Amino acid sequence: PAGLVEGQNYTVLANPIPQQQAGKVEVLEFFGYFCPHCAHLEPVLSKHAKSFKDDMYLRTEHVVWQKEMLTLARLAAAVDMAAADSKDVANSHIFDAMVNQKIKLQNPEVLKKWLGEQTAFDGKKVLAAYESPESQARADKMQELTETFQIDGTPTVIVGGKYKVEFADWESGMNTIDLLADKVREEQKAA
Numbered sequence: 286p287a288g289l290v291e292g293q294n295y296t297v298l299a300n301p302i303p304q305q306q307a308g309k310v311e312v313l314e315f316f317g318y319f320c321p322h323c324a325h326l327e328p329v330l331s332k333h334a335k336s337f338k339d340d341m342y343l344r345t346e347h348v349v350w351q352k353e354m355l356t357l358a359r360l361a362a363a364v365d366m367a368a369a370d371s372k373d374v375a376n377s378h379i380f381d382a383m384v385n386q387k388i389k390l391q392n393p394e395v396l397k398k399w400l401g402e403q404t405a406f407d408g409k410k411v412l413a414a415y416e417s418p419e420s421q422a423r424a425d426k427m428q429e430l431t432e433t434f435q436i437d438g439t440p441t442v443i444v445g446g447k448y449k450v451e452f453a454d455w456e457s458g459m460n461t462i463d464l465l466a467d468k469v470r471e472e473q474k475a476a
Contacts, residue, residue, distance in 0.1 A: 289468065294451050294461045301447040302434055305344055308473070310466045312337075313344045315431070315441040318357050318390065323440045324380035329455040330442075331373045333462070341466055348436055349428035356391050362423030363400075363414035371406035378405065445469030 289295055304311040314330065316323040334343045347361035348354070360379065368375040382388040382399065390396045400412040414420055430436070442450040442458065444465035452458040 289461070289464050292451075294453070294457075295444075295465060296449045296451060298434070298443065298447050298449060300434065302430070302443060304446045306342065308340075310338075310341045310445055310469045310473075311344055311443075312341060312462055312466065313346065313443045313446070315346050315348050315436045315439055315443075316361075317348050317354075317439045318360065318379050318383050320439045321384050324384045326440050326455050327376060327380055329459060331376070333459040338466075340470065346427050346430055347424075348431045348439055349424070350431065353391055355424050355428065356393055356396065358424035358427040359415060359420045360390060360396060360400075361427070362420040363411045364406075365423070366414035366417075366420060367410040368406045375403070375406040375411065378403065445472070 291297065302313060304313075312334075314326075316326075330343070337343065345361065345365065347358040349358050364372055364375045364379070379390065383390055388395065388399065390399060397412060397415070400408045400415060402408060403411070440452075442452075442462065444450065444462055445468070448465045448469070450458050450461050450465070452461075
């Protein structure tokens, strides 16, 4: 009962999600910018990700549960593309915009205006990313992942493509991520 217990603090996916970077340990968060629980996890996870080793990385994907949500996915794509060393600031701004200020960032007309107004992160370069074909492609991939892997709740955190974190609370889930990262790192090396 110490450490990792399957069915208690993690479960194993029936179908693993391909990792973006081979030979590394991926921590993958599915989220939505509208989601109060995602907004609460965000500061905990972003703080924790600073402690990640050089072979670990945090990948994020916005769920797409309806056609209207592709706009938010394209925003998520644009942030990941161009926000660079201010991505944490960007995500924090966006979560607060949607969850606390009730800003309708799912409306492209509201979103583009709002991005152009950002300087705490580079709003204009993120807008450039939003307007580029790449963010459309990334949003479509997000939808494919949502549907293929039947992601039906947010936040969902998966380590090493195969281990789903079963959260008791956010802080304790960070310990689970660390234990899973070690499990993955050494499974992968042994293979």
